[PDB]
A paper describes a structure:
Here, we report cryo-EM structures of human H1-containing tetranucleosome arrays with four physiologically relevant NRLs. The structures show a zig-zag arrangement of nucleosomes, with nucleosomes 1 and 3 forming a stack. H1 binding to stacked nucleosomes depends on the NRL, whereas H1 always binds to the non-stacked nucleosomes 2 and 4. H1 contacts DNA with L1, the amino-terminal part of α2 together with L3, and α3 to stabilize the nucleosome and contribute to chromatin compaction.
Residue numbers in the entry:
A (entry chain u): 35 to 109
B (entry chain d), F (entry chain h): 30 to 124
C (entry chain e), H (entry chain a): 37 to 133
D (entry chain f), I (entry chain b): 20 to 102
E (entry chain c), G (entry chain g): 10 to 118
DNA sequence: CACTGGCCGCCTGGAGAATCCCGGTGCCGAGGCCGCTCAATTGGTCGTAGACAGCTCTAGCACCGCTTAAACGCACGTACGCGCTGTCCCCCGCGTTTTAACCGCCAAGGGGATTACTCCCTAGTCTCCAGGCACGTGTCAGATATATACATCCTGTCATGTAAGTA
DNA sequence: TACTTACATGACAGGATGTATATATCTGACACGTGCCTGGAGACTAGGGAGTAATCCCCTTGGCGGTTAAAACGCGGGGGACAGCGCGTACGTGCGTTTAAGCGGTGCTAGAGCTGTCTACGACCAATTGAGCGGCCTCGGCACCGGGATTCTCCAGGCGGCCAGTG
């Protein structure tokens, strides 16, 4: 079971916090290093990214939707 | 009656009856077999004629056609066709 | 609700049918009209054997069928399934035409 | 007597079924007019020579044998009509 | 006291005509002179090619539960042998259609 | 002691001088010209032969080669070759 | 007692040899008979083709400002003419290289 | 800091050079050795005219040139610039090899 | 007198030069060994043909005529070698 | 942070439909028979094509010594494929209406094909003669070498937009 | 929320080097004079292939009525292409080293190639035939029609993860 992957996405983006936003591939590899079967959960990560952008807690750097780069909010 | 139009009909029919006793042939398939024997005859004869010209030879013999088989026919088709060519020519020389 | 197939499924059945089928795919008399139109551009009021029109139609179907073999290969080459004019032009150029 | 437009005589479903024999699963919309032109060009190449065969033989009737010869000279040999 | 007219195909044990192929070499105008074993060899090659392709045609006909060779059987016999395919890459069979082959990308998952 | 080997040297030389009085030729370009004229001669001769066989004609006339060059030479080269060959047979018959 | 020999190359006014083309046609074994106008027509076509390609070769060499034509000039002449490229589509010129043809995407910017 | 070109312009200078120049691109001796190695497998104890070796050299270079033009067309067809094994496979298969 | 690994004699920069003459910007690393194989198969074809020409000719030396003639049959016509 | 109920992605059973498979039935092309003829056969003759033997000579193979050009390997780098997803739009599928393709039926005649006549031309042969190729030589066009000059490609610098830090 | 500032990025100039440009040199590759003998050629002739006149018939063209299968067009909708964007690698490019290609020189020889011999070999001519072809005819394999299973495909409902709600 464990926690849902929203905390996983927040941890993945907060692990590095470099100048540009983190891409989908880098965050998926981050969750793979943390430990998760991302092979059967691609639409899961897509819905998590879209949901977390829509609440405004995540701001998307350059890309559109679940593509591109994602960076942390102002506060 | 008209002018006779030569074909390979009964010949291919004999070959089919030798290889398949119960299997028949259609007329369009027989036209395609006429096209086949004419095309392969044309390819072998044309390349072997060029081989005759290249060595400045006035004769096309079994050696030139054999070499033409090695050029045109691929692989095991080539060497098997060589085998039946040799058996045919040895039977003919032995009458 | 009336029954309804998904796209490509009928196309795939049409595929397996037309390699399963052997008959002509071009309408006979419109092809005859086309070959007469092309012929009168070179010599007017030409006459045709029906076997000649059928041989031209078979050869045209053969040319186009082989051309779409190459076109399908070029389309899957570009990671696509729908062919495009640049696929046809590519196949025609690589073939040497 | 004169014929102006038989390029549309090779209809779009005919091209569709040709490509279905060709193994094409999906056809773009711009394919059909181009293949009509391509077939027209191929028929230019074939029929010009087939005509040249006919007035080479001083004939008015286009024969299937001339078509067979014209195809096989292009290396697109057709079986089933020779003889 | 002329001898019995025996046939050169039966002399060589063949079915294809030695005499007609020899005459067509003489009349296809391919050399001034033609060796005697050349038509026998050429008829042997033709008879063997037709023998294999008719064998595959009859086998394909028996596969499709038909007792008669149709040109579809001929096209299936050409295209299912890769060496015969390489022999006849540029040749189209009348009314043979095309060999059933679908690329794996086209097929659904 | 040597044996004569035939080439198309002098004819290509006179033609290149006639179309360009000042321009020379290398030896390898001469070999390629020999190969070119041999290839074109063999193409036209073979197609003329096939036209001769297909209508059961045992003769090759300028009509046959005119048909052949209409078959092989594409577009504008065909009508120009027709023009020069017609003029050539015109001076040949008039002299 | 005999007329002076005057060549059919001079009769047609073509520098290509009518006699030699006729000899190669007879010994190239293409028909039983050859009409007399056929080598004249063939030699005229041959001379026209050679004159046109040598004209392009001389023009290309003058474009490279070189007074002798080389196989590179022959490649430049052949590939730049659409009818010659149609005639010599599958033909390779030795040591002539290729026509400079860089695809448009390969150029920077 | 010592000079260094960006990737690609040395390639195009090579393009302009060996398209502008004509000379042979395979080292002659290893090509001759490869030809002798292949011909040894077919009929034993073969020797080669030197002109025959350069003839195979010109023909092989031009054959590879034609293939690499076809793979160039295939690569730009697939929105790429770097050619791949499937490009040569496509070129050979469309041409019919 | 034994020849064992001469396909590696066609070096990688030699393949790079060939692709430069063909007009190639970038060549993958997987390309070199299979172009060695493709060229290997091509020489198998043309040298097999030339060997048949040779043993038909009852000579022991492969000549340029046999080369250009084998290329000529396969639709790969070569100029400049006495054809 | 654990428990938990509703909501969306996925599993599963079942219904309809296209095809496969089983019959019957009538039919028209495949096979078989008969007359014919023409093309294969045979034997002698005659000319000749190439196999064979032998000699000569020449280029291909081997060996060797320098002599660098390039093959090669490594390292820094950047750019190219490319995997993934979001977005737009384009073509298959199906239903209905339209319409000309097919059939089939009949008239007519255009020329394809065949036969006959007759002659235009073309290949063969003895004789003759002259043009193009081997051979030799001489000689300037171009490769090479060296010295200038710009193109251009990368890099350094200035200006500016813009995101970030901040009161 | 505006003020300020430093960093990414486009605009502009400049150096270095690779390529473009100018001039000497020498050399061997192109080009020209000679011998010649072989290949072209002119006259005549035997004889045949093809050009041309006539016909017929049959096979192509033209035309009319009916069916409906094929096409055409619109709605709908899903899937296919594709734009973009980081990522991660995978060659590109530069640089020093190995070495093997390349060049120049020498020797052997084995095979290419030319020339006399002649003998197997194949084409050619008169006569004869028997196997292959044109035509007819029959019939049953197969084309077409009709009915039941099966596989396939798509959707309805039903389950699991999961996401939101709660304690």
């Amino acid at each position: 079971s464990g926690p849902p992957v929203s905390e996983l996405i927040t941890k993945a983006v907060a692990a590095s916090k470099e100048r540009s936003g983190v891409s989908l591939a880098a965050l998926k590899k981050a969750l793979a290093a943390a430990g998760y079967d991302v092979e059967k959960n691609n639409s899961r990560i897509k819905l998590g990214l879209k949901s977390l952008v829509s609440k405004g807690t995540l701001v998307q750097t350059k890309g559109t939707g679940a593509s591109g780069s994602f960076k942390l909010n102002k506060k | 009656k008209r002018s006779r139009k030569e074909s390979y009909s009964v010949y291919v029919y004999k070959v089919l009856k030798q290889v398949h006793p119960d299997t028949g042939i259609s007329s369009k398939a027989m036209g395609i077999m006429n096209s086949f024997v004419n095309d392969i005859f044309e390819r072998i004869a044309g390349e072997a004629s060029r081989l005759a010209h290249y060595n400045k030879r006035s004769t096309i013999t079994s050696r030139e056609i054999q070499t033409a088989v090695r050029l045109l026919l691929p692989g095991e088709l080539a060497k098997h066709a060589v085998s039946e060519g040799t058996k045919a020519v040895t039977k003919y020389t032995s009458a | 609700k009336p029954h309804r197939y998904r796209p490509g499924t009928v196309a795939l059945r049409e595929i397996r049918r037309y390699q399963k089928s052997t008959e002509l795919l071009i309408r006979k008399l419109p092809f005859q009209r086309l070959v007469r139109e092309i012929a009168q551009d070179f010599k007017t009021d030409l006459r045709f054997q029906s076997s000649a029109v059928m041989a031209l139609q078979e050869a045209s179907e053969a040319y186009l069928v082989g051309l779409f073999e190459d076109t399908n290969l070029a389309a899957i080459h570009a990671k696509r399934v729908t062919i495009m004019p640049k696929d046809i032009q590519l196949a025609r150029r690589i073939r040497g035409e | 007597k004169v014929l102006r437009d038989n390029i549309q005589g090779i209809t779009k479903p005919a091209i569709r079924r040709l490509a279905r024999r060709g193994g094409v699963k999906r056809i773009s919309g711009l394919i059909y007019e181009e293949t009509r032109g391509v077939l027209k060009v191929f028929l230019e190449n074939v029929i010009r020579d087939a005509v040249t065969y006919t007035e080479h033989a001083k004939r008015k009737t286009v024969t299937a044998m001339d078509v067979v010869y014209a195809l096989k000279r292009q290396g697109r040999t057709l079986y089933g009509f020779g003889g | 006291a002329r001898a019995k007219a025996k046939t050169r195909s039966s002399r060589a044990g063949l079915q294809f005509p030695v005499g007609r192929v020899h005459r067509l070499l003489r009349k296809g105008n391919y050399s001034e002179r033609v060796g005697a074993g050349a038509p026998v060899y050429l008829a042997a090659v033709l008879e063997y090619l037709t023998a294999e392709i008719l064998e595959l045609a009859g086998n394909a006909a028996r596969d499709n539960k038909k007792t008669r060779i149709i040109p579809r059987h001929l096209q299936l016999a050409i295209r299912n042998d890769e060496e015969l395919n390489k022999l006849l890459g540029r040749v189209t069979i009348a009314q043979g259609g095309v060999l059933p082959n679908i690329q794996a990308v086209l097929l659904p998952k």
